[PDB]
Amino acid sequence: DGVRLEEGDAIDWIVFDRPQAANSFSATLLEQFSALVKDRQANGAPVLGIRGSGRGFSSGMDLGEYNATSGPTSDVLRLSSYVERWLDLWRHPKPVIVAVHGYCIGVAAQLASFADILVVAEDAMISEPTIPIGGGFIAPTWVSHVGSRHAKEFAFLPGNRIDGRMAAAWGWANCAVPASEVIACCESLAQRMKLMPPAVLAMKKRSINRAMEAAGFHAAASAIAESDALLHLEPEVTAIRNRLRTEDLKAVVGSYAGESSQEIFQRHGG
Amino acid sequence: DGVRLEEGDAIDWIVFDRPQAANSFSATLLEQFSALVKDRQANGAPVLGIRGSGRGFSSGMDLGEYNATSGPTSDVLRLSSYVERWLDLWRHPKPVIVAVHGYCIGVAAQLASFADILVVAEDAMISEPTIPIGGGFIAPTWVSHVGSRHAKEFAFLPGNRIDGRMAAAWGWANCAVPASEVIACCESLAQRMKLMPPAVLAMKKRSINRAMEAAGFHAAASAIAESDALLHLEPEVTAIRNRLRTEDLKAVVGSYAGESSQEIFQRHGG
Amino acid sequence: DGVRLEEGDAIDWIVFDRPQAANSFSATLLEQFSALVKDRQANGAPVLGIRGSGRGFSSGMDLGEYNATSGPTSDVLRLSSYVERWLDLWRHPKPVIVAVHGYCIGVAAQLASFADILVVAEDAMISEPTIPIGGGFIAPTWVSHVGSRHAKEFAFLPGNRIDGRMAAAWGWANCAVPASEVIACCESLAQRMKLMPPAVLAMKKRSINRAMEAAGFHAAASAIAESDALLHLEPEVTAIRNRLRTEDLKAVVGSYAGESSQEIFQRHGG
Amino acid sequence: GVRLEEGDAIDWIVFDRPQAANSFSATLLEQFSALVKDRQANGAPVLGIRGSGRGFSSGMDLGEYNATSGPTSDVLRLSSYVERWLDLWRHPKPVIVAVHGYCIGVAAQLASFADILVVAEDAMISEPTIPIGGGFIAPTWVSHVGSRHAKEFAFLPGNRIDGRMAAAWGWANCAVPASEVIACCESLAQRMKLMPPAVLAMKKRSINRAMEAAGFHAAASAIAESDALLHLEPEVTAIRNRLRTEDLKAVVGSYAGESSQEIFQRHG
Amino acid sequence: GVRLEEGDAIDWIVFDRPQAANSFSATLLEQFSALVKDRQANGAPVLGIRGSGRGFSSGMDLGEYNATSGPTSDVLRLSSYVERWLDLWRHPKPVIVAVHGYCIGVAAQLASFADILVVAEDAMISEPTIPIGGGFIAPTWVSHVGSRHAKEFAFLPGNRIDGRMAAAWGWANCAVPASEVIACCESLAQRMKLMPPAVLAMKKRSINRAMEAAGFHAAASAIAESDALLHLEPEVTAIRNRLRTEDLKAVVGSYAGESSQEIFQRHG
Amino acid sequence: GVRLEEGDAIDWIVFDRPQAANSFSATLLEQFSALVKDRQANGAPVLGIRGSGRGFSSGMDLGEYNATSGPTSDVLRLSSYVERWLDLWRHPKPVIVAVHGYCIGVAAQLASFADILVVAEDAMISEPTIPIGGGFIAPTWVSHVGSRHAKEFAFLPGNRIDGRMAAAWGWANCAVPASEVIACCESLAQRMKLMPPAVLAMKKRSINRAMEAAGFHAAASAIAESDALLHLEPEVTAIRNRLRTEDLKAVVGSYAGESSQEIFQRHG
């Protein structure tokens, strides 16, 4: 568990609800998430929505999901399994709307790249993982939404982060609204979508997805798992991870944390 | 007929001129349109322009072009024939500039996706078809211009619509100008283009088109006809179409019409 | 020579420094440029930067690099060799940051399309070649950054040009900053990037590049050389080039120079 | 109607519906996929697929098509079949398919997503006997046999080739006598068993990326739509009505005749 | 120089220019396309293409190249040929091409965009005899024969294969005796006739999407440019000038010799 | 350990390291690339590659792998090999590869980026004898042989085919007797010599664009990553440790056995 379904007449919400862990993803959460997604294929409201309870959307993957001992291929298959759970959103017969408020970190920002429609709080924080313990996994899925210059900007600075406004301006989100209006905004869109026959929604979505596929959407994801798994085995990365065995999390993060690229541009008069 | 050619020294305009039907497309109009496009390959001015007479660019396809009795494949081939007429713009040796004012609805917004340069009136209305009688035909051709988030937003709400400013901001148009300056703006661009040797214009265009093709532009269109033809056969769609046999058009539209997605975002503080 | 390396602790700059020719590219400059790029693969700072000395980034290719007598295939191979030197930036294991101030003309604007991160002076001038002596070479490499409408706009008007602000807004640059802050801005980004292990930077970049490749990035460049080489042989182009044999450069440019597309849009109320 | 036969080099998933010539039903297919998933991390290092009895499979049972659910619901059903086959392609283990006797319709689609395909010399690989659909099976063959043979296969009703032909076209790795098909696959698997499983898995992912770069995944992206459209053509629904109202043999008998390869042979 | 022979299973478009060995002129090609378009919704369910007399076609007549119009005008002319062939590929009916005797140059490009290709065992499929161009024909073969044979074909002047070889390479579906080429295509068409036309059309569109996903359409996107560039190489214009000023046989005689496959045979 | 033998139709780059069975070292490879680059605009119109002595090449020497440099450094090393082979593919001259005796591992990757490939009937084309990597060589074959044979090749340890098989699979243009391999390539080159070099160069670029449109370049974009991951699997590092600590023959002897094609033959 750690995931809840809130039914409604226009949109059913899948809600991450692990307050104790800032809605971070575990293997168990993910199994339950996929079970809901599948169940909502033919049950419930005509739109499917995803959001977080509490203070933020999701802090990303629990660090303890990574297991060094199982070897690199087993890591490749684990990471790839995550991408397939997100591709179930893309293949889904209903429109999938993702509502992000507060924090959206790491692999949670990968999930959201596979939504149909993405509405973000103006003040949300969309972030790379805070410590450079991996890579080549999230930002590549942003390329078709934001282009390669911003994807590379996002990826190349440790703990880089943008706000909802910036995510909308880059093209990652459809629109940034005040935090208090995020849910109601999605509900308003869904109430209009509800007037369409579900078969219409489904075929409109399949047909747009073929154009994305033609533009490389699916093949873009074909080696990101390998990329990230290789980095989990670099010695300089296993040493950083070892710092976690001894020291406080905040101290390790603290040696990487600092200005984001957008803060640097603003400071220099952009 | 219903289409006119207005020759000029920098740009020849193909002009939709069916006032009685709000410049909507019929089989006859389309044959004449393609004949002009072909004739302008080697005759006339160095730029080709497309625009509407009167109150708007075009209201789209006449409803009566759809014929249930001929079967689905015959519908696929009809729809596909439309896409090929638009691809003639893309393959054309001259720059093709499309000037939109007032309304640009349905299949007319598909046409305009295959222009080289698109100039739109700030106050134009670019719209999906008003009743969800089809789908998976127009928005997929927008993906390479606006991305998948806005294409899906545009597609998933019945009668969704944006203004010229929004179309420019999404990347669908090059620029939005006041309605009174649309034509003169295109003429000004064309007067500069005129200084280039025509062979230069032609090769610059072919070479950019290869990069689009590499990015999936042509393959993106390969099943949109099938998508739309399938929807024309859904029972829930044939029932809506049957409402047309009995009731006033305005009453049927009226049960689908309402706020656009961009109006919803504005209302919620975007 | 005409290229210099300025080492630093976060970023090493490759600096074009041919004041006598406005940092224009010659065969010799290009050999030295590639030698530096290669040497910086495993030596020096973790980020590689490219910029110009003096008044601007680069005025592009020396006209005298084109040799009519060697035939079209030999021209194809020369032009293609330029593209491969730029692809070495894309394949490079370090982040490559390009800093543009003042002018960035012709083939120099092609180079910059293969950078990872591009920072431009607000007041820089990014320009097509001033006389239509070629084509189908630069703008096709802009398509994945700016879309096909702006690429075609840029290409179809002789000597078309945009400023840094516009280049940022189109998506060609990451950000436009005042001229005096361009270098320091790049240094600030690089100081953050420096905290990442180099293997991380390298794999993040390879993985993003696979997503670009999936979207056609590499295949987009496969015939641009052919396109440009064909145009060098059009009679109307060889006549313009012949005007150079007799007349002042400024007189020939002067018959093509004029308003840019963006100036035309502004004049018409965009 | 599916069972698992475990072994030390290869586990076989075995279609076993003698009453229906190993044809596929929604229930069979759910069980098939549950086995494929289970074999991801359990059992032998190779996964095999084959049929019990007289043939591999006669394809979909006709009753899976439901006119009543509408075209999109049909698209989603057909697409769900393709995804079951893509599970083979995504699978961490080599997937070997062994075909004997008949392999008809959608069962010949399934086999296009195997890694290795061993066919009985004798086998009959066939389009559906009656033209009640299309654009679903042959497009998945293009990658293996080229467009010429895929179009030749698709454009004649009940077209069919034997195992030898399938091997020569490139659809099978090799054609062997019926009595050796299983033992041949076990022999291959015994050699594959010497490789670390992680090696097998990665070799397969890397080859799959080269297929994907060559269009493999995108080539399947509208085949469901194509077939569902044809289920609604008036000429197809009239043929379907013949089936509901005359003897199957009479309807088949109206379409049956020489295969393309028999035509080529006859003309030298 | 083209005619239509109607039939009940297949209508044949027949090149018939005996005085020029069925070579293509701008006038022939306009008439060819007008027939292809007409046969979209009229006549028999299959469309055939073939040549009358001694061969399929000797290719483009040399006079279609005009140095005077400039390179871009040349690119547009060559590209217009490719679009005429793409009309076959887009066509709602199966397109069967029957080749006997000679099939040279651009006529061997045309035949790459047929659905089904039946060749006389005897036929000669040939690159142009003199190297006056390039990069136009063989790239359209890659999809059918692979890059190795396409490069082997393209890199030797006047390289040529027989029908058997073309079938073994994958360019033809099958090679039969010359006297059976037509009757073979009619036989196939009589079976195809039993399928509803809508079924044929959709089967073909769906297979074409799998080709397109595999690069088929994009593979043609710069072949016009490649060939037009070579029409302007000094070494090519000097060969062309030999043609304007010596006997054709003398110029050909300077390039003619063993084909690649004759070389391989000779070396065992 | 590489030399250049100049000729008037073809210049041969010749691997010549008898002490190491023409295996590749970083020094060999730098010299190989310096020759390939030099032959861009110098010498004969065709470039050839071959091995001196008993075989083409045994592949990479094992000492090029350095565990100490980390995985990314390994990815960059493997990728640098692929780029050396892509220089052949980008090269302005036809590149003909002649293989006799053994062609193992990465040497069988190299040969996939030749234009024309002539193999001795006799030759042994082999995966590495011990499974110490993967996902690097076979993915480059898919384009030439299809996914079925590429997977068959990759999934069995030390799998191997002879030249005949390589020709029948499509990896080689043709298999000839060992004593004719060179003279066969010279014969082809003497015909290619009659073509203007500019023609050859453009024919090749245009065919390469059709390959690229079919995925050729993108198919190689993660093979380095795949192989470098497998160099870090515990089961692979244990096999590698056997090599550092037992006789090579004992370790090989644990994996050696029937090839897939021997298995198919044995089963009829």
When scoring F155, F156, F211 by the number of chain D Cβ atoms within 10 A, the one with the most, hence best to mutate, is F155
Record: contact F73-C199, CB cut-off 8 A:
yes
Is residue D20 classed exposed, middle or buried when 0-12, 13-18 and 19+ CB atoms within 10 A define those classes?
Answer: middle
F188 residue type, one letter = L
> Could you give the count of Cα atoms lying within 13 Å of A266 in the half-sphere of its Cβ?
7
Taking the CA atoms of residue B77, residue B79, residue B80 and residue B81 in that order, the dihedral angle to the nearest 10 degrees is 90
Pairing mode of beta strands D95-99, D116-120: parallel
Distance of residue C122 Cα from the nearest chain A Cα, in angstroms: 9
Chains contacting E (3 or more CB pairs within 8 Å):
B, C, D, F
Taking the C-alpha atoms of residue F228 and residue A231, their distance in angstroms, rounded to an integer, is 11
If you search the block for the tokens 């069995």, which residue do you land on?
A: F156
Record: contact A143-C211, CB cut-off 8 A:
yes
- Chain A, chain C: beta-carbon pairs less than 8 Å apart: 148
Task: For E207-250, give the secondary structure using H, E and C.
Answer: HHHHHHHCCCCHHHCCHHHHHHHHCCCHHHHHHHHHHHHCCHHH
When scoring F46, F191, F216 by the number of chain E Cβ atoms within 10 A, the one with the most, hence best to mutate, is F191
Among candidate residues C221, C64, C229, the one with its CA nearest the CA of residue C135: C229
Measured at the CA of F222, the angle between CA F220 and CA F223, to 5 degrees, comes to 70
What is the length of chain D?
268
Measured at the CA of F197, the angle between CA F193 and CA F203, to 5 degrees, comes to 105
Is residue C41 classed exposed, middle or buried when 0-12, 13-18 and 19+ CB atoms within 10 A define those classes?
Answer: middle
Residues of F within 8 A of C214 (CB-CB) are: 218
Is the separation of the CB atoms in D140 and D223 below 8 Å?
A: yes
Taking the C-alpha atoms of residue B160 and residue B131, their distance in angstroms, rounded to an integer, is 10
Is the separation of the CB atoms in E163 and E172 below 8 Å?
A: yes
Among the partner residues F226, F228, F234, nearest to A71 by beta-carbon distance: F234
Chain B touched by D235 (CB under 8 Å): yes
A249 residue type, one letter = L
Q: In E91-196, which residue ranges form alpha helices assigned H by DSSP?
A: 107-110, 142-145, 147-154, 163-169, 181-192
What residues have CB less than 8 Å from B113, skipping those under 6 apart? B86, B138, B141, B142, B145, B172
Residues of E within 8 A of C223 (CB-CB) are: 221-222, 225
DSSP B11-35: EEEEEE--GGGTT-B-HHHHHHHHH
If you search the block for the tokens 């050839």, which residue do you land on?
A: F48
DSSP structural state of residue F125:
E
What residues have CB less than 8 Å from D264, skipping those under 6 apart? E173, E174, E176, E184
Among candidate residues C51, C48, C87, C99, the one with its CA nearest the CA of residue C202: C48
C126 φ, ψ to 5°? -105, 120
CA–CA distance from B100 to each of A106, B16, B52, B104 (Å)? Answer: 42, 11, 7, 7
Tokens of C247: 């007349």
- A 10 A CB-CB count for C253 gives 15
| Chain C residue nearest residue F75, CA to CA | C203
Record: contact C269-B177, CB cut-off 8 A:
yes
Among candidate residues A52, A65, A48, the one with its CA nearest the CA of residue A23: A52
Record: contact F202-C73, CB cut-off 8 A:
yes
Taking the C-alpha atoms of residue A104 and residue A127, their distance in angstroms, rounded to an integer, is 6
DSSP C48-98: EEEEESTT-SB--B-GGG--GGG-HHHHHHHHHHHHHHHHHHHH-SS-EEE
Gyration radius from chain D CA atoms: 18
| Chain C residue nearest residue F80, CA to CA | C91
Chain D touched by F265 (CB under 8 Å): no
Taking the C-alpha atoms of residue B263 and residue B267, their distance in angstroms, rounded to an integer, is 6
SS3 F220: helix
What residues have CB less than 8 Å from D70, skipping those under 6 apart? A199, B233, B234, B235, B236
Measured at the CA of C246, the angle between CA C240 and CA C247, to 5 degrees, comes to 80
Put simply, the chain D residues between 183 and 222 with a CB less than 8 A from any chain E CB are 214-216, 218-222
Is the separation of the CB atoms in F140 and F113 below 8 Å?
A: yes
Taking the C-alpha atoms of residue F85 and residue C245, their distance in angstroms, rounded to an integer, is 43
Among candidate residues E168, E161, E147, the one with its CA nearest the CA of residue F116: E147
Among candidate residues B51, B91, B81, the one with its CA nearest the CA of residue B186: B51
Record: contact F229-A229, CB cut-off 8 A:
yes
Tokens of E97: 């091409």
Instruction: Report the structure determination method.
Output: X-ray
- A 10 A CB-CB count for A248 gives 10
DSSP structural state of residue D256:
-
Tokens of B22: 């709000």
- A 10 A CB-CB count for D268 gives 12
- A 10 A CB-CB count for D67 gives 11
Is the separation of the CB atoms in D113 and D140 below 8 Å?
A: yes
Taking the C-alpha atoms of residue F268 and residue F260, their distance in angstroms, rounded to an integer, is 13
Record: contact D194-F218, CB cut-off 8 A:
no
Tokens of A181: 């209006």
Record: contact A222-D201, CB cut-off 8 A:
no
Taking the C-alpha atoms of residue E223 and residue E239, their distance in angstroms, rounded to an integer, is 21
DSSP structural state of residue B192:
H
Side by side, which strands form the sheet with F102-104?
F102-104, F124-126, F160-162
Taking the C-alpha atoms of residue F122 and residue F178, their distance in angstroms, rounded to an integer, is 7
Among the partner residues F135, F150, F258, nearest to D205 by beta-carbon distance: F135
What domains sit in chain F, N to C, each tagged with a CATH number? 1-268 (3.90.226.10)
Residues of C within 8 A of B184 (CB-CB) are: 268
**Angle, in degrees to the nearest 10, between helices D197-213 and F223-230:** 180
In B23-177, which ranges are E strands? 47-52, 96-100, 103-105, 117-121, 125-127, 161-163, 175-177
Is the separation of the CB atoms in E56 and E15 below 8 Å?
A: yes
D196 φ, ψ to 5°? -55, 140
Q: List, in sequence order, every residue forming a beta bridge with E176; answer none if it has no partner.
A: E120
Tokens of F215: 């995925």
Chain A touched by D225 (CB under 8 Å): yes
* Resolution in Å, one decimal place: 2.2
DSSP chain A: --EEEE--SSEEEEEE--GGGTT-B-HHHHHHHHHHHHHTTTSS-SEEEEEESTT-SB--B-GGG--GGG-HHHHHHHHHHHHHHHHHHHH-SS-EEEEE-SEEETTHHHHGGG-SEEEEETT-EEE--SS-S--SSSGGGGHHHH-HHHHHHHHHSTT-EEEHHHHHHHTSSSEEE-GGGHHHHHHHHHHHHTTS-HHHHHHHHHHHHHHHHHTTTTGGGSSHHHHHHHHTT-HHHHHHHHHHHHS-HHHHHHTT----HHHHHHHTT-
If you search the block for the tokens 């109150």, which residue do you land on?
A: B55
Taking the C-alpha atoms of residue A268 and residue C182, their distance in angstroms, rounded to an integer, is 8
